[PDB]
């Protein structure tokens, strides 16, 4: 269950406040997944009393966004059992909503979550995960690109196992960090979205098996 509360002495236009709260929520708390298990109780609230006087809506929104994101990355790093934060950056999508759909599918793939947990540069599991968006028939495996960190591992340019081998090895390095990026481009249009999750560990399983929560 997500519970998050924000408090400010900012004075804001009530209608602007709602609009901006929603925009930030959609890009942060609604952009994170530990275990896909959307709770019966998720609550997110902002209270703005007026005491510090008027604040620019855009400045405030920016500030809420930074606050929210920092909290989201906190949650992802602290995922039950996690050793690693996973950040999935999708670009070139048909629209932002498809980019989000693909990011979620990838960051919620148990096989992706365990490969990252073992530091296994098994990028083929990310190709699989993208592949599960089988109703997005404008995603073409020939046009899709996949990187871990700053290392593009798909598509093969030329052969043969190359190549994949080296750079496989470079992906293994980045995976050793506590924060892991998977970048994916669909080469459809301009849709973009980043989502946040974590690896899948024996610790997740033990806690949640042992463990009435």
């Amino acid at each position: 269950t997500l519970l998050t509360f924000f408090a400010t002495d900012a004075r804001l236009d009530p209608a602007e406040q709602d609009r901006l709260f929603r925009r930030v929520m959609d890009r942060t708390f609604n952009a994170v997944s530990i275990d896909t298990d959307t709770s019966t109780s998720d609550t997110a609230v902002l209270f703005a009393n007026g005491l510090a006087g008027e604040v620019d809506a855009g400045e405030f929104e920016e500030a809420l966004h930074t606050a929210a994101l920092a909290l989201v990355k906190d949650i992802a790093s602290d995922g039950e059992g996690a050793a690693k934060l996973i950040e999935v950056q999708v670009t070139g999508a048909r629209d932002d909503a498809q980019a989000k759909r693909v990011g979620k599918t990838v960051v919620n793939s148990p096989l992706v979550k365990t490969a990252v947990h073992g530091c296994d540069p098994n990028w083929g599991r990310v190709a699989m995960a993208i592949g599960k968006c089988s109703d997005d028939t404008d995603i073409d495996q020939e046009r899709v690109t996949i990187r871990f960190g700053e290392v593009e591992v798909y598509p093969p340019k030329a052969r043969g196992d190359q190549a994949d081998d080296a750079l496989r090895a470079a992906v293994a390095e980045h995976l050793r960090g506590d924060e892991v990026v998977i970048g994916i481009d669909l080469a459809i249009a301009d849709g973009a979205f980043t989502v946040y999750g974590c690896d899948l560990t024996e610790g997740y399983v033990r806690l949640n098996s042992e463990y009435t929560t």
Binding site: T1, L2, L3, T4, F5, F6, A7, T8, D9, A10, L12, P14, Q17, D18, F21, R22, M25, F29, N30, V32, S33, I34, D35, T36, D37, T38, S39, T40, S41, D42, T43, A44, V45, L46, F47, A48, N49, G50, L51, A52, G53, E54, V55, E59, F60, A63, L64, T66, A67, A68, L71, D74, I75, D78, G79, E80, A82, N108, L207, T213
Partner: protein
């Protein structure tokens, strides 16, 4: 750090460890509210009352109970969600519809109502402002650390707290 916000935290035995598990955040001033929630079909009674409470864009606080969700608890749990939300409003002299309620932890377990009833009878406004750090801790369940953040903007302060590291893919509106 924001002006007008106070925090009450206390142990009410939602788990049997003497830890702060009952939180009241409140503004001493009227406050505009924005909120989004689970759309779960098993949405707890706490959620429904929150929706109703923010319908007028007006709210001053929230009571939070940790280590029990008050979900799938039937009419008993609905009654308990109302009683608790209302008793908090009443004890601070706020109108019901300006107090939200939120609850986290186990599903399918009734609140320890007598323990909560005894605590409510003692509840009143915190002396002095602040205590978000205390709120941050008192809301935790399977979190390993409290989560808290502070930003300054245009002479105002914004403080956020969050919790939740399992049963976590929010899809809130």
């Amino acid at each position: 750090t924001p002006r007008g916000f106070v925090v009450h935290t206390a142990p009410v035995g939602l788990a049997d460890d003497g830890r702060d598990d009952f939180t009241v955040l409140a503004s001493t001033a009227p406050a505009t509210v924005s909120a989004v929630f689970t759309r779960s079909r098993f949405a707890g009674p706490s959620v429904v009352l929150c929706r109703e409470a923010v319908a007028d864009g007006q709210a001053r606080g929230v009571v939070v109970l940790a280590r029990n969700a008050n979900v799938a608890t039937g009419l008993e749990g609905e009654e308990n969600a109302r009683e608790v939300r209302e008793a908090v409003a009443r004890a601070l002299g706020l109108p019901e519809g300006e107090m939200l309620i939120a609850s986290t932890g186990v599903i399918g377990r009734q609140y320890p109502m007598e323990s909560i009833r005894e605590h409510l009878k003692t509840l009143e406004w915190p002396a002095g402002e602040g205590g978000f750090d205390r709120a941050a801790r008192a809301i935790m369940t399977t979190d390993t650390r409290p989560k808290e953040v502070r930003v300054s903007v245009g002479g105002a302060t914004l403080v956020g707290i969050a919790k939740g590291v399992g049963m976590l893919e929010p899809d809130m509106a």
